[PDB]
Structure 1
Amino acid sequence: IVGGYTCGANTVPYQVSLNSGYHFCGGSLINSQWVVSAAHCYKSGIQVRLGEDNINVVEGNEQFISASKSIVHPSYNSNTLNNDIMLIKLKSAASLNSRVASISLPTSCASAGTQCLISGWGNTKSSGTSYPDVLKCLKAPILSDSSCKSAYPGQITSNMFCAGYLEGGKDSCQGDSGGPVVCSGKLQGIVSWGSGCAQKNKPGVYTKVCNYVSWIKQTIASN
């Protein structure tokens, strides 16, 4: 997260860190046994880490649970990143409490202008590199589809939306990948892609979660 702020320990209870010996992606807990992330975050041997703030220090509220199965969206295209969403099932159900909680799925899509909360342990520099140990937060508005498409001609599909600032300076970045974009207590987006970080006229692009609720629910009900 570039140009954001320190969230505060466990203030984003649904935020998870996907670990394969090191943090490599964010994720969102949607129930005691499932996590939603980006398909481009796929890899084997994933351990889901819940209740995390400083990912390099055991602070007392963590729950480390290995993933038993990963399900990449049936239509995920790694070249265009269309349908950049993946479900991860935990080998054991997480113990839900005030610091480890699930985030609700949307009942309807959000609109341009809606203020949302984006979070993650990704790079904090627009130029250069610096990874934080504690969770970072950024409040940002969803941008109109027209402005998004104008920012990225020929690349924005109906399963994507832009959020952030066209002026730059505040955006998601490498490491935040797969993380949440929550608006009014609902998971509306997943950190998917962009061009560089916090660059002018290059806002972050996110997977439009509302288009996948049917698939998520049906998949969870049978796995």
Structure 2
Amino acid sequence: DKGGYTCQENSVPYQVSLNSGYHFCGGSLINDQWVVSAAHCYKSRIQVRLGEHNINVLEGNEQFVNAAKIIKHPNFDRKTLNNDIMLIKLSSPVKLNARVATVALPSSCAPAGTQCLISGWGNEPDLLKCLDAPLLPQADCEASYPGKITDNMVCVGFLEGGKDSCQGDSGGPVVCNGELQGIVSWGYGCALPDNPGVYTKVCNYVDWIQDTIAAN
């Protein structure tokens, strides 16, 4: 499978599950009223579930909130996946605690080699999974995906494969040194050699995110 390990219960408090009858994508809580995810995770109706660990059991720490507004990046390309980022405004503020918390937006772009934490239920998803992986140099990313990588994408993982994010993880976070540096987006297969996961480079969208939240 994924090649990761089960995260410690509620050790990733900013992680959310997007649900429209069942879990289909992940996301990250950036403030008590907004969630950031991937644009290809768009659906007209979305329920955000916070404080989750085992998505198949009512554990008692979860908060269920419906999305009030769903805003995709205006330049999202469904074919190339460039600008694969989306903002979701919750119907009401969530209650922040030890199991439901926000993750900071990047102060700058993390350099290649930076170790990060990728999380998601991408595994019959059940427990939240974790993976420690480094941001790869852009040249290696480009070499793995000839002519498919734009400057708004970054590869995270291993060129030998073995560990990677997979279906069910889209929209999820890639956090490095306490900042959200990436959003699970795509890849050819999962954990295959010479094909690490490709992620949306969040540091290129901080202003868009901040400006959008301010106007909505």
TM-score, with normalisation over the residues of structure 2? 0.99
The reply to whether residue 219 of structure 1 matches residue 207 of structure 2 is: no
Which residue matches 1:136?
129
Which residue matches 1:64?
64
Alpha-carbon distance in structure 2 between the residues aligned to 1:192 and 1:58: 28
Q: 5+ residue gaps in structure 1?
A: 125-130
Which residue matches 2:181?
188
Which AA in structure 2 matches 1:158?
D
Alpha-carbon distance in structure 1 between the residues aligned to 2:60 and 2:143: 46
2:154 to 161, 172, 176: 161
Which AA in structure 2 matches 1:199?
L
Shift of 1:132: 3.3
The reply to whether residue 207 of structure 1 matches residue 206 of structure 2 is: no
Q: How many residues align?
A: 216
Which AA in structure 1 matches 2:195?
K
The reply to whether residue 145 of structure 1 matches residue 138 of structure 2 is: yes
Which residue matches 1:197?
190
Which residue matches 2:111?
111
Which AA in structure 2 matches 1:219?
T
Would you say the 8 A contact 2:117–2:174 is kept in 1? yes
Look up the SS of the partner of 2:212 in the other structure.
helix
The reply to whether residue 53 of structure 1 matches residue 53 of structure 2 is: yes
Alpha-carbon distance in structure 1 between the residues aligned to 2:166 and 2:200: 15
Q: 5+ residue gaps in structure 2?
A: none
Alpha-carbon distance in structure 1 between the residues aligned to 2:61 and 2:179: 23
The reply to whether residue 175 of structure 1 matches residue 184 of structure 2 is: no
Would you say the 8 A contact 2:6–2:128 is kept in 1? yes
Shift of 1:81: 0.1
Shift of 1:111: 0.7
Shift of 1:8: 1.6
Look up the SS of the partner of 2:112 in the other structure.
coil
Which residue matches 1:93?
93
Which residue matches 1:11?
11
Alpha-carbon distance in structure 1 between the residues aligned to 2:197 and 2:77: 18
Alpha-carbon distance in structure 1 between the residues aligned to 2:114 and 2:11: 21
Which residue matches 1:23?
23
Look up the SS of the partner of 2:205 in the other structure.
helix
TM-score, with normalisation over the residues of structure 1? 0.96
> What pairs up with 1:72-83 in 2 under 5 angstroms?
72-83=72-83
% identical aligned pairs: 74
* Cα deviations by residue, 1:109-153 (Å, 9 ceiling, x for unpaired): 01100000000001x3xxxxxx33010000000000000000000
Alpha-carbon distance in structure 2 between the residues aligned to 1:12 and 1:187: 12
* Cα deviations by residue, 1:9-47 (Å, 9 ceiling, x for unpaired): 111000000000100000000000000000000001100
Runs (4+) off by over 2 Å:
none
Alpha carbon RMSD of aligned pairs, Å? 0.7
